[PDB]
Amino acid sequence: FSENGEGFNLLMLAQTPSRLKKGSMTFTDSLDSRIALKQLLISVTKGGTTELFALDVNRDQYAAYTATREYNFRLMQLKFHTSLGLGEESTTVAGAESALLKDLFDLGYRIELDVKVDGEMNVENGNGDTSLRALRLARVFDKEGKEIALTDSRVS
Amino acid sequence: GLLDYTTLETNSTELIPVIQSGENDEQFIDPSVLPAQTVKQGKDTFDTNFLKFSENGEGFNLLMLAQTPSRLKKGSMTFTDSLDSRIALKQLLISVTKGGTTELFALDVNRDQYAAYTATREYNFRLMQLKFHTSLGLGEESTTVAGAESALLKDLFDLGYRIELDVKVDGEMNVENGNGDTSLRALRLARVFDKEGKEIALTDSRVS
Amino acid sequence: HEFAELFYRTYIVTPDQAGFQLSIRRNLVWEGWTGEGLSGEKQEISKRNILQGLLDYTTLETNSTELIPVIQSGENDEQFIDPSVLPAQTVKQGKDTFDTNFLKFSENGEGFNLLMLAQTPSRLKKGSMTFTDSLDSRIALKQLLISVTKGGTTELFALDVNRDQYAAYTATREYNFRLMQLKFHTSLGLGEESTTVAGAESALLKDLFDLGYRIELDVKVDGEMNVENGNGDTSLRALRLARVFDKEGKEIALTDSRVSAALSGLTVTGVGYSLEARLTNINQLEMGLLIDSDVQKQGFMIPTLPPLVIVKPAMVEDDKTYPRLEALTTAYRIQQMRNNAVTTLLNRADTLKSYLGVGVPHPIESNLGLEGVGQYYVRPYYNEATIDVLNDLNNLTSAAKQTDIQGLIVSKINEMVYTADQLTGYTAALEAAFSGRSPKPHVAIGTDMRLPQYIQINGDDRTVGIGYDYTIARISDLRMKDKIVMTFILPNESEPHPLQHGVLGFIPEYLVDFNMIRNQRIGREIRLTPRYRYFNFLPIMLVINVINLEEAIAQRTALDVNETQVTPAS
Amino acid sequence: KPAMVEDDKTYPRLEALTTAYRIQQMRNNAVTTLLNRADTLKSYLGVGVPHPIESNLGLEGVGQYYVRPYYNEATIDVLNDLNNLTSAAKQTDIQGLIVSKINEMVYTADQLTGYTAALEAAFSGRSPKPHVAIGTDMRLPQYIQINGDDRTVGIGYDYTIARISDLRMKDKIVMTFILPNESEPHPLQHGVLGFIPEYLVDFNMIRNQRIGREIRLTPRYRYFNFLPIMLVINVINLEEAIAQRTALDVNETQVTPAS
């Protein structure tokens, strides 16, 4: 996430060695209208232990870039503003089960976080940026689908 | 009212933030940074101040903030009150700081490129959307608020130079129930301009 | 009313629309693709508007077909002169950087093949040079290089001889018959201020240069060039000192004492040269200039406004306490069209003053913080001038003071409008947008009830400057009290257009009349809910503040005659 | 243009190419050449000092066979060279100030170069009065309008005022001798434009293994100079003279003690 505010040029990072042999040019190309994030890598850390969750975000419809022609005739907008849940069967990238959330998962609770990510992309130029805006623990569910407050002693 | 402009000009259907101490005071920047400003709508006398940015926390509610004693006496807030189609950012307040001295300037972002909520729905059919992304700069004579000219820019100003700022502001509003928030995404110094309108390097001795 | 009408043309909108969209076409030009910078770079290349190119000259023009010699280290060094005499020079053509030196004069050996000699790095990727390309219909020398040696010190002079009378290649009929010919027997001069390549006067000729003398060298250069396969060779035929010119242009004898002293032991030799030849291909391997287009579109929303409420008991209608509906209508019309209009005008003026500085024209698409679509047609400009009538005026005698003040104010308005036209490039945009007609700018004048009696001229021909049309506005709001606003508008059309100062977004609202119940009371209420919003398009405005008028008229005016410093003090 | 569709926005029609051609050829190159002409004459000859006829054989142009070479420049300080009676008469007096200087320079150039003799010689049976051309920006040319003085560029003279938008000639007047009756290349007009039209072509280029259609327009022309004469006038601080009071700069010329 580029919180320094300086963007990236996507047509650079993705030039393959075949294209290098093919030549060196990325400026007559055009990106398709379809842009969406594959995965959000969120780090669950507590006391120095880090777990990585490879979450497939492509299957939430708010992760799809939408065209808002308000600056130029080729910019499109990204607004993924929802909650993702980490269930008991959530698996790490290496394939192991959760460890920091193991205490709640063995108690059958479900943890979901509100994700507020914003970005922009231009097809013609390749200019674009996407920066994290707001992420936080949100609420806790039980088996019966009854909300459990964050301030409850069993989960606080 | 044909000569003076105040006899006919009155507003009584405007939402304005209102302050009352220690009971709703977490949507307002602490008064130790800026004293409260007195504004009068209708016959009610009350104080207002800029709503604060919130990044990782809960947003604000405009309806609960904009409830004036005239509306108290008429009855408690109901659910049929509706927000208008046009909502805009009036003032964006920044502080230029160098050496411990704080100078605040009120940018009149009202009437800027995209300082007005545009109809952009992705979740609800009511969610109003704002994307205020533009280069907003300070001129070579732009006087600070509360009188006089700024001192921290005295050297650049006396040389005839101009500075520019990039502003990235995002915010969402729901005209159905009064829930929404605003966040600051990026706001930094970007470029410096000469009196002849030609960009010079940021590595120049005077500019640095 | 007239006043808000001049600065904002009314635009009616259907009630259902909640906002109207303004999409404009803009034509773009930029040089090449960005291509590789690391393996490429994010395209920071300035796509600059073509109308900007109407004003400055660096937007256009490129040299992309010149057959500039290019050195390859260790391959063709022997055609170029020895780099000991002169280090490599770098010139830019498009996106390439490479080193160039003047060619060596062929004496007896094989000549040079220019086409294979002119491989820029781009052309190498472009594919190996094959002979289906043909040279320029005319070729010539760019610069001629000689070395003035006196005692051992060498000085270089880059004699720019291009566009000489006798430096253009010509056709001939011998040997081959695609052959071009270069006969160059001409007198070259070395000016009394002429500077070397490094940018300094000739030390060996400083003494000669002091007495106001010029050196003329007769030069003889010949060579051949073929336009079929680029073969060509040239040789130094004859070059020597010939004669001397003076400041007043009469030949000075070579045996004269001054000349003989100045020309002791001076030897002049030729070293190098260059050719102005361009590959006039039939399909072109060059991108020349690229033309692109973007679309920019702005949003505009029309709010709701506080309602205007009537009260009247409803079994009988009154005409004495509440008149016909005209009262509500006129109250709404004044409240809309005057108070809000003046407020938005002054707010616009102060916003421009804050953002844009004073008297400085900013380039297109650079420092915008305002509204419009005119910024893509004209450079922004804002300026203000204060008039101290008491201290600035010219009057020999009384019974002419009115003419005096009107002359000063008319001169000031002329200067403002003229400088605005000259700097903004507004009239060029007006000409470009409208084809088949060339309208002159129309200037609007808004002010209080004072100045109209002085801006209407009684006794002089000029009023706003002949060649300009005007419309005077009179208004009684105290915010305009002793103030003048100025701008450019177009009164011949009634549609949203980029060159109009402003448009009044106006949605008609129909009067509603139905019984309403306040605190369980019954009466007929006539409710008017207005909606509108004053918009702006053009970011150009001129404002003049005139003060001390009363004092100037009532108090003794006095010729501020310039006592000018002829009695020793300066 | 990508060669699988056609447009009107991303495809600017032939009109856009025509406009680009018009700009590049008609204005910018001509102005560059004129300023280069001025600079090279300045360097070769110097200010105010002519040269004998047929004293140059390698100087650009051919019309050195008829008129002595001459180049000169001058400046006007409107701030200090302005006497005013009434602020309702100031503008006319400024215009007269500029016009008189124009006239005097024209007369001086004519007298030194002997232009009238050349015009009478090269044309048999005609005695045409010289024609002066006015190249200037778009701020001045409203300041050559007065009837305050009968002389506009001087009696016995016809003139034409030309505008231009380019900023490089800010408040600069360029003057020369032309001839409006001619339409052929002759050594008495300032110069001719060798112009030959060309037509555009559109065809599929496959370069570096890419697909696209390109439209090419080949302009071919050249600017040439004949007359080695030109006069340049500069106007400085025109705005200040209007801006502040400029009353009688009355020189109090010392019938007083100590002088």
Author numbering:
A (entry chain D): 132 to 287
B (entry chain Z): 80 to 287
C (entry chain Y): 28 to 597
D (entry chain c): 339 to 597
Task: Please quote the paper that reports this structure.
We observe the tail fibers are branched and rearranged dramatically upon cell surface attachment. This complex configuration involves fourteen putative tail fibers with depolymerase activity that provide ϕKp24 with the ability to infect a broad panel of capsular polysaccharide (CPS) types of Klebsiella pneumoniae. In this study, we combine cryo-electron microscopy methods, protein structure prediction methods, molecular simulations, microbiological and machine learning approaches to explore the capsid, tail, and tail fibers of ϕKp24. We determine the structure of the capsid and tail at 4.1 Å and 3.0 Å resolution.
Each pentamer consists of five MCP monomers. In comparison with a gp372 in a hexamer, the N-terminal in the pentamer’s gp372 shows a different folding direction. In addition, gp372 in a pentamer changes the relative orientation of the triangular body and the hand compared to the MCP in a hexagon, which makes gp372 more curved in a pentamer. Overall, the MCP interaction regions in a pentamer are similar to those seen in the hexamer. However, the increased curvature of the pentamer alters the relative orientation between the triangular body and hand regions, leading to differential stabilizing contacts. Specifically, in the pentamer MCP, residues R501 and R583 in the triangular body interact with residues D448 and E442, respectively, in the triangular body of the clockwise neighbor. The interactions with the clockwise hand region are reduced overall, involving residues K380 and R558 interacting with residues E220 and D163, respectively. In contrast to the hexamer arrangement, the C-terminal loops in the pentamer do not appear to form a large, well-defined pore in the density map. Nevertheless, we do observe a small opening at the center of the pentamer that may be capable of solvent transport.
